[PDB]
């Protein structure tokens, strides 16, 4: 029994490039590990279960390549409600042409194509080992919420539900 990409990457980042270019068979298995970390398969080979704590990173594009301001986002995004309802953070990285802000992106790409060095800001870019060690040290922490943050959380949730509840 050979294996896919969700089994060699057990505890970590599982990324998907071109999310809308896939099919229903990929989506039905991605949504199953997106909801809860246990996959169960019952085919003529085996009827077994296996766990895979993974974090899904997805990169997608709309139906016509770019966005459409005359179209609704439920019609602009071809993904169904159960897929993005499970998605807590969706980033609409939309590009808008401007006069002032485009020059900084052009200056930054010409600066990184001129030489490998980053711009002269008063900050030094940290190497991968130090923040890898920081992520491994921060992962053992178990924070507990208080009551003063509890009364803010429930009021913001009630207001967000009423505002979201066309």
């Amino acid at each position: 029994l050979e294996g896919g990409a969700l089994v060699l990457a057990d505890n970590g980042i599982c990324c998907i490039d071109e999310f809308d270019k896939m099919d229903e068979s990929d989506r039905t298995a991605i949504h199953e590990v997106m909801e809860q970390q246990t996959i169960s398969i019952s085919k003529a080979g085996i009827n077994t279960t296996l766990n895979a704590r993974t974090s899904i990173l997805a990169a997608a594009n709309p139906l016509y390549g770019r966005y459409n301001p005359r179209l609704s986002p439920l019609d602009n995004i071809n993904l169904p409600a159960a897929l993005l309802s499970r998605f807590d953070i969706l980033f609409l990285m939309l590009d808008i042409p401007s006069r002032d802000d485009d020059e900084k992106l052009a200056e930054h790409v010409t600066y990184v194509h001129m030489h490998n060095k980053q711009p002269d800001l008063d900050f030094t870019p940290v190497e991968p080992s130090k923040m890898r060690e920081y992520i491994a040290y921060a992962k053992t922490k178990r924070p507990v919420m208080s009551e003063a943050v509890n009364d803010y959380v429930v009021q913001a949730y009630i207001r967000l539900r009423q505002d979201s509840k066309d």
Partner: protein, 133 residues
């Protein structure tokens, strides 16, 4: 006596009393941005050109503020005080008009002295009423 008080100058003094709020001092009447919201709320209720009650206006005020969540829905009692701020400047008048069910019963019908041409200028400067139009 003005030149005695100061120890057609006055016709100039008296006409600016009458010409203004529609061109300029409309925003003087609505320093509150919600007062700008409630002023457009009246005109959206004027589609049903009826006896524009303070309740039917409050009906369209809630059912729009639940769609666009610009502010929380406020009280009817607050809705009573805020429309009177619109009243004392001289924009909208309130009268106790006629409904003849039991007796001569008095529901309050409003009327606005503004036009949509003098509305559309002062709302494109504020894109928070732009959801509401």
């Amino acid at each position: 006596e003005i030149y005695e008080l100061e120890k057609l100058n006055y016709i100039a003094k008296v006409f600016s009393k009458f010409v203004n709020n529609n061109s300029t001092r409309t925003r003087i009447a609505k320093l509150n941005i919600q007062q700008k919201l409630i002023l457009c709320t009246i005109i959206q209720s004027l589609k049903l050109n009826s006896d524009a009650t303070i309740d039917e206006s409050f009906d369209h005020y809630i059912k729009a503020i639940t769609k666009t969540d610009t502010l929380a829905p406020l009280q009817r009692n607050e809705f009573l005080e805020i429309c009177t701020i619109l009243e004392t400047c001289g924009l909208v008048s309130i009268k106790k008009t006629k409904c003849k069910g039991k007796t001569k019963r008095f529901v309050d019908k409003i009327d606005v002295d503004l036009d949509m041409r003098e509305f559309y200028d002062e709302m494109t400067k504020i894109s928070i009423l732009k959801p509401f139009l």
